[PDB]
Amino acid sequence: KKPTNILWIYMEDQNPWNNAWGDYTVSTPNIKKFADQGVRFTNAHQPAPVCSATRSALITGQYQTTLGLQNHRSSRASYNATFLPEGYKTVPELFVDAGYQTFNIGKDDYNFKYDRSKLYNAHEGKAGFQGAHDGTKFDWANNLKNKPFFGQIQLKGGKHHNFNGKDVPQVDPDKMTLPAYYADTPATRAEWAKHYKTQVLSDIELGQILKELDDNNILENTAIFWFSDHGMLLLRHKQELYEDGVKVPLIISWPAGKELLKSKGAVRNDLISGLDIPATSLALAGIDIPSYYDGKNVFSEEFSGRDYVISAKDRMDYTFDRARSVRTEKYRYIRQYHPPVEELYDLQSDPDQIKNLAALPKYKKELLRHRQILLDWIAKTDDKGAYPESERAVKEVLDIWGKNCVSTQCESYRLHHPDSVNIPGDKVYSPIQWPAYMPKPKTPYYSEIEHIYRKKFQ
Amino acid sequence: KKPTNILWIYMEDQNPWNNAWGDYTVSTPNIKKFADQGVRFTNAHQPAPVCSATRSALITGQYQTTLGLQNHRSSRASYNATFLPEGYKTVPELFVDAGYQTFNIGKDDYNFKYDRSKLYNAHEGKAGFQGAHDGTKFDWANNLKNKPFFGQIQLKGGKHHNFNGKDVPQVDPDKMTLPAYYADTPATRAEWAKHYKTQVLSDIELGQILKELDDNNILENTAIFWFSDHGMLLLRHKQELYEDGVKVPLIISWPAGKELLKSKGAVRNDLISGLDIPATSLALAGIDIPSYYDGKNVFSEEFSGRDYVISAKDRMDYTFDRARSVRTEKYRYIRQYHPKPVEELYDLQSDPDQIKNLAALPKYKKELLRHRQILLDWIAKTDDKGAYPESERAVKEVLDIWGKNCVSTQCESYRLHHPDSVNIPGDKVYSPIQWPAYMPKPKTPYYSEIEHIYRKKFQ
Ligand SMILES: [Ca+2]
Ligand SMILES: [Ca+2]
Ligand SMILES: [Cl-]
Ligand SMILES: [Cl-]
Ligand SMILES: [Cl-]
Ligand SMILES: [Cl-]
Ligand SMILES: [Cl-]
Ligand SMILES: [Cl-]
Ligand SMILES: [Cl-]
Numbered sequence: 001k002k003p004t005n006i007l008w009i010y011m012e013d014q015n016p017w018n019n020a021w022g023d024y025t026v027s028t029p030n031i032k033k034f035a036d037q038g039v040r041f042t043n044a045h046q047p048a049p050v051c052s053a054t055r056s057a058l059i060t061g062q063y064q065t066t067l068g069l070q071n072h073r074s075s076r077a078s079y080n081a082t083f084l085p086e087g088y089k090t091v092p093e094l095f096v097d098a099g100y101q102t103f104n105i106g107k108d109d110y111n112f113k114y115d116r117s118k119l120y121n122a123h124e125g126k127a128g129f130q131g132a133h134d135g136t137k138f139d140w141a142n143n144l145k146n147k148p149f150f151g152q153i154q155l156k157g158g159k160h161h162n163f164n165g166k167d168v169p170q171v172d173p174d175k176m177t178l179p180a181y182y183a184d185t186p187a188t189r190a191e192w193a194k195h196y197k198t199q200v201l202s203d204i205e206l207g208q209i210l211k212e213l214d215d216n217n218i219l220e221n222t223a224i225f226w227f228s229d230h231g232m233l234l235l236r237h238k239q240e241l242y243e244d245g246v247k248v249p250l251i252i253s254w255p256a257g258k259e260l261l262k263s264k265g266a267v268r269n270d271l272i273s274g275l276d277i278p279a280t281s282l283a284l285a286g287i288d289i290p291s292y293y294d295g296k297n298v299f300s301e302e303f304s305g306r307d308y309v310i311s312a313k314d315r316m317d318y319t320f321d322r323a324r325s326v327r328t329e330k331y332r333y334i335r336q337y338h339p340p341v342e343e344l345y346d347l348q349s350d351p352d353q354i355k356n357l358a359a360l361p362k363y364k365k366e367l368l369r370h371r372q373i374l375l376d377w378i379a380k381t382d383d384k385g386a387y388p389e390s391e392r393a394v395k396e397v398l399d400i401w402g403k404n405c406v407s408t409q410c411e412s413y414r415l416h417h418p419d420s421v422n423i424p425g426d427k428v429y430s431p432i433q434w435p436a437y438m439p440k441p442k443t444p445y446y447s448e449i450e451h452i453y454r455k456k457f458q
Numbered sequence: 459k460k461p462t463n464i465l466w467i468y469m470e471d472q473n474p475w476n477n478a479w480g481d482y483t484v485s486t487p488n489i490k491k492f493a494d495q496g497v498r499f500t501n502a503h504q505p506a507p508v509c510s511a512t513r514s515a516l517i518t519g520q521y522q523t524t525l526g527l528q529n530h531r532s533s534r535a536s537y538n539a540t541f542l543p544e545g546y547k548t549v550p551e552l553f554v555d556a557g558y559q560t561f562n563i564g565k566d567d568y569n570f571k572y573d574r575s576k577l578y579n580a581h582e583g584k585a586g587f588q589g590a591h592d593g594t595k596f597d598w599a600n601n602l603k604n605k606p607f608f609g610q611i612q613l614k615g616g617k618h619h620n621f622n623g624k625d626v627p628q629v630d631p632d633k634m635t636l637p638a639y640y641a642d643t644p645a646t647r648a649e650w651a652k653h654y655k656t657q658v659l660s661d662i663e664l665g666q667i668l669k670e671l672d673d674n675n676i677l678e679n680t681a682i683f684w685f686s687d688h689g690m691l692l693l694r695h696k697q698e699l700y701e702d703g704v705k706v707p708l709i710i711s712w713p714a715g716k717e718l719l720k721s722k723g724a725v726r727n728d729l730i731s732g733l734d735i736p737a738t739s740l741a742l743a744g745i746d747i748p749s750y751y752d753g754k755n756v757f758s759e760e761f762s763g764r765d766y767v768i769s770a771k772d773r774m775d776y777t778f779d780r781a782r783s784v785r786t787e788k789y790r791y792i793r794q795y796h797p798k799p800v801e802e803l804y805d806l807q808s809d810p811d812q813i814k815n816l817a818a819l820p821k822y823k824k825e826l827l828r829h830r831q832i833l834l835d836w837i838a839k840t841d842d843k844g845a846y847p848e849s850e851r852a853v854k855e856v857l858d859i860w861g862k863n864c865v866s867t868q869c870e871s872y873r874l875h876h877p878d879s880v881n882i883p884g885d886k887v888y889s890p891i892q893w894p895a896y897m898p899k900p901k902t903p904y905y906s907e908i909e910h911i912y913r914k915k916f917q
Binding site: 066067085086087088089290291292340372374375376377378379380381382383386436 | 524525543544545546547748749750798799833834835836837838839840841842845895
């Protein structure tokens with residue numbers, strides 16, 4: 001007994017502030033019922049805290065840092081490209097090869113060049129934001145009611161802008177409880193109340209998708225993976241609060257396999273990586289997990305929870321950072337490469353990560369233990385974050401963010417190209433030819449997504 | 459029940475033309491007795507056919523192509539550097555961390571920068587050929603007769619230069635049987651007879667090392683790995699004959715453990731990769747094999763022979779090539795990326811000298827695709843770094859060492875984009891590379907000498 005379909009309900013930028021996680025600030029009945037009849041994961045940690053890093057990792061099955069996909073965003077311009085290795089199979093291509101129809105409605109946002117028709121064969125792509133391909137809308141639930149499919153639906157999550165729907169409650173910014181030692185201003189309180197409203201919008205959209213499956217008798221045989229690509233990125237001065245940036249909601253539901261999925265627990269507290277989502281998707285559908293994928297089937301009998309979960313943060317827009325985190329059952333550890341410098345937090349007693357324990361003698365052994373888990377991971381994956389981005393990749397940042405990039409990478413680039421700082425890179429550098437094993441489609445939007453230069457930023 | 463020591467008897471550039479392999483052209487009694495009492499491997503295929511590629515692969519435990527170590531030679535200059543990832547453990551470091559004394563007498567010839575004292579803690583290094591470190595000679599068999607060690611002794615193998623020893627037999631070039639369609643000249647017949655003489659020199663040297671171990675009671679408790687870094691590189695026009703380039707002699711002997719080793723066969727014909735040598739050494743000494751190593755323990759109960767062995771060839775001195783090979787039980791497949799890639803398929807049973815390319819024969823289409831798919835899996839799994847062009851700084855290193863001999867497109871384009879500095883030494887053109895914080899560069903003087911690789915004689 002395997003499900004017929006896989007469906008990822010893929011939310012942008014959302015923390016699990018919903019009834020199923022015990023939070024009754026707003027009413028989330030669809031999510032609560034959905035969680036009650038499925039498997040809820042309370043320790044699912046994505047490999048990255050930002051869009052294109054997480055989304056590239058889950059679609060390739062590996063840490064975004066292993067294949068040079070770690071920088072948000074990257075490989076978008078005509079003159080700067082990353083290609084997956086020859087022979088490589090993304091998760092959708094694995095499903096296509098096994099006979100399924102595949103789609104992703106909404107943004108891809110991956111940090112490599114690709115022929116989308118090899119990944120998603122049930123619909124066409126179109127130009128998206130900042131070099132991304134997007135998947136066109138279509139009546140997937142009707143068209144594929146009798147064709148086994150791996151689909152994704154991208155929902156706006158915390159980035160929903162429109163709250164005029166008569167089902168969105170009032171949320172008073174003055175009633176919001178902020179994290180400890182977090183900036184308490186009208187703007188942060190407004191961001192909190194807005195994020196609660198987006199929980200209701202997510203709850204509504206979940207209800208609509210479940211109805212659409214039900215109206216085409218697709219609800220029983222579809223394994224649904226319900227998750228966000230990261231939580232809200234929160235800053236206390238310069239300190240990123242990683243725990244609730246990488247820990248995301250995850251509910252897995254397969255109605256006709258309920259008892260099989262719940263066998264290890266209807267509420268899973270063991271440590272899960274977001275990279276286990278594609279691997280579990282493959283296993284549930286009866287597709288081998290490639291040996292080079294990092295994920296595991298979280299429902300297999302041999303799966304007893306990860307000892308630790310690794311996350312990575314690299315460049316974000318025009319901020320050239322590099323940090324690596326080891327999450328164990330009790331601690332989050334951070335290695336910060338651009339303050340060498342280390343952080344360690346006991347989450348049980350310090351959930352907002354205020355008390356760095358790295359320099360306390362009592363915690364030296366736990367510190368070294370987390371550090372060594374990280375060194376093992378760097379040695380195993382050859383973390384491409386250790387290597388600097390190229391001239392062409394820096395030029396791509398300049399095309400998109402212009403004067404906003406004040407990093408020493410960007411200034412040094414300007415000092416070396418004073419003749420062309422504001423000339424679009426596609427007029428400075430030759431286009432990158434796609435490799436023999438993957439010719440560039442002639443589809444017109446493939447050239448439109450490469451027009452990344454933004455005059456308004458210089 | 460584990461051996462106490464690990465020793466690699468490590469030969470340069472040598473084919474198994476010896477009595478243990480059934481070749482009595484010359485007398486090799488030490489090798490014959492050694493193979494008789496140990497385990498002989500007839501299908502051991504190195505991951506490369508040249509020195510720095512094979513040697514970097516075995517010392518790191520991974521295909522040289524996975525870590526950017528594939529180009530022979532590379533990362534030698536002051537301005538061009540490859541470092542292993544933070545936290546990475548080469549095989550000697552794994553033995554140091556476990557308490558052993560470690561040494562390699564003779565050349566290292568690795569394509570990355572390293573602090574040799576972290577690898578080999580039982581002796582010092584010295585300047586070597588073309589940017590390599592070498593290990594100084596010392597009385598290892600006595601110094602370490604009571605200290606568990608992992609050691610390597612580098613022997614000259616097919617590159618021995620002096621044949622006046624009174625026990626080197628005369629070998630007639632006119633009696634040499636060359637490979638089918640191989641150039642039949644006085645030079646190649648001379649090379650054949652010379653190579654047979656080097657078999658006797660390797661036989662002598664094997665006897666001496668065994669005597670040193672016996673004189674110090676190290677003979678019983680020492681697992682020895684006796685092998686070469688590759689066979690001779692043979693060309694027929696532009697075609698490299700990979701089968702006998704990568705397949706090397708390998709004998710493993712551990713006299714106190716004879717019966718355990720021989721359990722799966724005293725003569726082993728299953729497919730083995732040279733990367734299984736460090737993995738098997740680690741296993742015998744009771745050290746964990748890191749999850750990122752490619753080798754396996756060939757004496758483990760779970761080891762049932764490899765279904766295939768991968769080999770890779772990339773730049774060789776100033777020849778910028780890229781070829782990948784899948785060896786299966788019956789066939790060797792070659793994918794050639796700079797002839798878009800062209801493919802070769804040979805049935806070795808009927809075509810030992812690799813003359814009849816079967817790749818375009820409809821009868822062999824399925825065997826072709828099956829070998830192609832094996833290679834594609836390996837590229838996807840390892841992100842074969844030969845898919846990426848060498849940097850500007852690496853081309854300069856080639857130009858420094860080889861000068862006007864490099865006629866490649868990469869070189870000729872470099873000369874076009876730097877017409878004013880073509881013959882200026884690279885260390886006056888490019889700034890030195892700072893070693894990473896996790897591995898500071900020793901002050902030791904020969905570390906500066908080995909980076910002086912410019913050769914005026916070549917331009
Ligand atoms: Ca996002
Ligand atoms: Ca050699
Ligand atoms: Cl825009
Ligand atoms: Cl649309
Ligand atoms: Cl299972
Ligand atoms: Cl604009
Ligand atoms: Cl040489
Ligand atoms: Cl003859
Ligand atoms: Cl075993």
